[PDB]
Structures are given as structure tokens and as C-alpha cells.
Design an enzyme around this catalytic site. Sequence first.
Site, PDB file in Angstrom:
ATOM      1  N   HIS A 111       0.654  -1.199  -0.047  1.00  0.00           N
ATOM      2  CA  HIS A 111       0.007   0.123  -0.029  1.00  0.00           C
ATOM      3  C   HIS A 111       0.894   1.284   0.067  1.00  0.00           C
ATOM      4  O   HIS A 111       0.452   2.073   0.593  1.00  0.00           O
ATOM      5  CB  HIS A 111      -1.019   0.145   0.974  1.00  0.00           C
ATOM      6  CG  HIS A 111      -1.983  -0.996   1.080  1.00  0.00           C
ATOM      7  ND1 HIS A 111      -1.791  -2.082   1.825  1.00  0.00           N
ATOM      8  CD2 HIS A 111      -2.996  -1.147   0.351  1.00  0.00           C
ATOM      9  CE1 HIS A 111      -2.794  -2.872   1.521  1.00  0.00           C
ATOM     10  NE2 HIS A 111      -3.458  -2.264   0.587  1.00  0.00           N
ATOM     11  N   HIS A 112       1.934   1.210  -0.602  1.00  0.00           N
ATOM     12  CA  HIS A 112       2.618   2.608  -0.461  1.00  0.00           C
ATOM     13  C   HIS A 112       2.974   3.108  -2.040  1.00  0.00           C
ATOM     14  O   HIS A 112       4.284   3.324  -2.397  1.00  0.00           O
ATOM     15  CB  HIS A 112       4.162   2.205   0.024  1.00  0.00           C
ATOM     16  CG  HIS A 112       4.148   1.526   1.336  1.00  0.00           C
ATOM     17  ND1 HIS A 112       4.902   0.529   1.723  1.00  0.00           N
ATOM     18  CD2 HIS A 112       2.818   1.438   2.263  1.00  0.00           C
ATOM     19  CE1 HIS A 112       4.622   0.202   3.003  1.00  0.00           C
ATOM     20  NE2 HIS A 112       3.302   0.797   3.286  1.00  0.00           N
TER      21      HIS A 112
END
Length: 508
Positions: A445-446
Site C-alpha cells: 500500500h505504498h
Amino acid sequence: NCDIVIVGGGSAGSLLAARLSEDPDSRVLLIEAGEEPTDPDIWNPAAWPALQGRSYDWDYRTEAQAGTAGRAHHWARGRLIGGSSCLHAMGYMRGHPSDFQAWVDASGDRRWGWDELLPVFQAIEDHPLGGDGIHGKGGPLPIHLPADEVSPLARAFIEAGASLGLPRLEGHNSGEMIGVTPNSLNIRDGRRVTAADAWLTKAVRGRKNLTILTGSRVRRLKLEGNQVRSLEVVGRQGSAEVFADQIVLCAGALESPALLMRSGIGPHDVLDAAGVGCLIDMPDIGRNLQDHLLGAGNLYAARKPVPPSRLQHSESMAYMRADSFTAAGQPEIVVGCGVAPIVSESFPAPAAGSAYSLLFGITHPTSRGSVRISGPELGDRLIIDPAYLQTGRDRERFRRALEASRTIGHRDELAGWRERELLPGTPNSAAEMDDFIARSVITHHHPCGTCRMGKDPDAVVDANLRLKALDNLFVVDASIMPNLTAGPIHAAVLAIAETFARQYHHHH
Ligand SMILES: Cc1cc2nc3c(=O)[nH]c(=O)nc-3n(C[C@H](O)[C@H](O)[C@H](O)COP(=O)(O)OP(=O)(O)OC[C@H]3O[C@@H](n4cnc5c(N)ncnc54)[C@H](O)[C@@H]3O)c2cc1C
Ligand SMILES: Cc1ncc(CO)c(CN)c1O
């Protein structure tokens, strides 16, 4: 209102709305696509995964990835005041000093180095080690160092890593990131604390010079010469034109480049294919897309019931070098202890409480992808190709990560919990390991990098975060990151926003 408009009320946007409006002579308007939060599950740290697929999650879908067994991936994103900070695993990791050295080299500016960022992180943090000259004291964002509430599984994992040679750290943020430690967390009094909680307080929101506009999507920026003159805002009611002297984009790694492309700013050929007139040809908008992966996972059957986390389920990342547990320096891989039996869609889930997963990842992927608009409209889906596992380095390093995970997983220090390994079991070759990894990896999720800051002529923004082709437009979110930090990027996005706030107050 009139002086500065901030597009996107997420992590960076929430911080900026607060910080810019500290100047009483500045009129600040914040425009957020989502609504204010009402769902109580949001503040329950242990409920973060259930948040996905709900109303305030964008839920993007990537193209099929050849490097991950042709799998397409789902990318959760915050759509509400507070942004992705609402959906967080709430881990707080500044990154490693060497991560930021690369930002300095890329940007040509010292301000983006660890030494200069140090007072910035400190201004952000309210840390229990505050006062040591390294961590922050009295800042708006609580940083919690879990101890008593750490899962006995996580403590066992920490011991396994420590026995292998990894040093014991107090959080990841001292400038030393390789070692073993519970993750530092943005939690206070058992409650998740978001960017919106920390910066958009009742007092801040009460300021007569701050206006917040929700349920409103900025569709296009309108140009006049070398300036953005106005913004077209689309709400539940219809569209309206908003004027501003300065415009700061905080729409995040996907939505900031999309807004620029919808506005005719971006790759001429990409805009052509999307049916958008090209006003400024910037080939690098949408490119340099990066993200972290985690292998889901080195899955273990438990010898006894695994009790639910009293925190956030993923309690302890162990960053390390790829070839040694005793070597120091910049991380190359990570193995994390997932108290929940986390696996990708490629595997059946074990009954709850019956298993735990060790997640494994690489910290600095060299693969690079892209985001392109598919058409001019808000409703036209983005074409997102993260290019997962496309380089030989990324693939080789992930073997090292899986190998590190299994070594830790089978330590005597975990014998109290481990019944046996369920996955991957018995890969007897590079190709077999590669296949398991490709089937197991999920997004960490980056996403970042799509409006890259750089000193070279075709960078999207300069070191001051100004879009190179215009005078009054800035990009201040994860999209400007030249490269991923070693671990979770929220601290970095906040550091980016704070340094821009400091720069704005310095020059006005
Ligand atoms: C499930 C999940 C867990 C995570 N866990 C962690 C963690 O434990 N640690 C960590 O460091 N990081 C974590 N992250 C990542 C971190 O939350 C993000 O990297 C960070 O929030 C990025 O902030 P930003 O300001 O760049 O964008 P965001 O915070 O995503 O903000 C973008 C905002 O702009 C709005 N917007 C978008 N387009 C428009 C438009 N056209 N007009 C108006 N508004 C618009 C959106 O609704 C959103 O509110 C996680 C991310 C996810 C998805
Ligand atoms: C999938 C996942 N696991 C664990 C963590 C702990 O930091 C995060 C946050 N990026 C995450 O996204």
C-alpha cells in the site's frame, strides 16, 4: 479561499490545511472528494482490513501483472477527510537516512536529506523518546511504542530475529532501521490517530480563514499563460469554478497525476489516446510509479490458538540486509510477523486462530511502472501498471526475503507457536520459488513517484515542489517521492508536507 487552494484532504492535505492557515493573512480552501468520517470502525486499530471495499475506499484495479503470475491487484485508497490515513495499518516508519540521500542526489537539494529532515520529523512527532535529540516531543502526531500489549507471537518472532544477530531497536526511527522491534504506531488511548485527527482539530477547523469543502472533486485546472487561474470543481449538485492565487495538489500518487492529465498536462501521446487536448507536454507525469510488495505469505499452522492482536495485526517488521542477519546499514529486505493468517487470493485461507503468516518483501524495488488516464472523465478508470517484479534484482532479492523469512520462521524461539509450515513448503529451485513468490505477493500500500521531484529538465517538480512548467502550482504528496523509503511511507509523506509548509511561510 482566495490565497491558496489545497486539492485533496488526505495525509498531506490535512497537514497543509492546518499549517498554511496558521498565517492569519492567508486564506486557505481545502477541497476533498470524500465525506467527513462517520464510520466508528475507522478508529478501531484492529478493524483496518475490514475498512477496505467500503464506501470511502477508491478501490483501484491494476492491469494484469506478468511478473506476478498475471494477477491483477486491488489498490485500496482513502476517499474522505483524512484520506489513506483513515485506512492505515497505522505503522510509523521515517525510513533510513540512505533512503533520503537518494532524494538529495535526485533533487540537488540538501533539504531532503536525513539531517535537514530531522527537525521536520521532530516537529511532527509526539514521541515517548522525545528529548533525546532524535525523536520529536510535543508534536501533533502521537507515536506509540508498544510493549506490554505486544502479542506473545510477535515477541517470539522478535526473539527469533534477535537470536540470529539482529539488534534490538526501540522503534525504527532513530536512523538505525535494521534490527528487531515492535512497529511504532499512530495510536493514543487505544485509538487510531489520523492526519485529520492530528492536524484538523476543532480549533484549526474553527479558523475564519480556513474553509473545507467536502464531497467535491477537482476535475480540471484551468490555465492562463504560465499560471493556473482557476479550478473546476464537481460536486453532488453540479460544477463550479474556483479561483486561487496558489494551488497545491495533495490528491496522492494516483489522483494527482490524473488531475494533471485531465487538465492537459502530461505525456502528449498519453493525452491524445485519452482524448484530452495537450497544453503542456510533460513526459514524466504518471511515470516512475513505485510500490512495495509483501509475500502473503510464509504461512505456518499454529501449535495452539493464535489470539487476536491487541494492536493492528502486523505488529513487527524486521528490516535487514539480504545476505546477513548481523550486517548493518540500509535495509534490503523485510520480514514481518502477521498475527493474522494472511494469504493472497492464490491460496485458501486457514480457519481463524489456526495459523499465522510471516510476510516478506524487498525494501527498495528497482522496477518502475506508470499510471495513465484512460479518458477525460472523472469516471474513466485509471490504467495502472505497477510493473511488479519486472527486474532481475527485484526477483533475486525477493528470494533472499523468502529465505530470510523461513530461517526466522523455523527458529526454536517460535517452536512454542509453530506446528509446521504450510507455505511455501518445498520449493526445490529458483523457478519454483519465483512462482510461489509471484503467486503470493500483494501490495504493501505504498504507491508513490508519479510526479517525481528532480533537478533534471524533465522532472515533474523541482526541489521546491513546483511543477516545472508553471509558476503557481505545487505537488505536495507521495507522488513527488523520487524513490520509496525502506518501509511504510506515511511518515515521509508527512515530512514532505511539513517541509513545504515551512517553505511557504518562509517565502510569502
Ligand atoms: C490500507 C492501507 C494501509 C496503510 N498503512 C500504512 C502504514 O501502516 N504506515 C504507513 O506509513 N503508510 C501506510 N499506508 C500508506 C499511506 O496511508 C499513504 O502513503 C499516505 O496516506 C499518502 O498520503 P497522500 O497525501 O499522498 O494521499 P492520500 O492520503 O491518499 O490523500 C489523497 C486525498 O485526496 C482526495 N482526492 C483525490 N483526488 C481528488 C480530486 N480530483 N479532487 C479532490 N480530492 C481528491 C482523496 O479522497 C484523498 O482524501 C497505507 C495505505 C493503505 C491504503
Ligand atoms: C499489508 C500491510 N501489512 C502491514 C503493515 C504494517 O505497517 C502495512 C502498512 N503499510 C500494510 O500495508
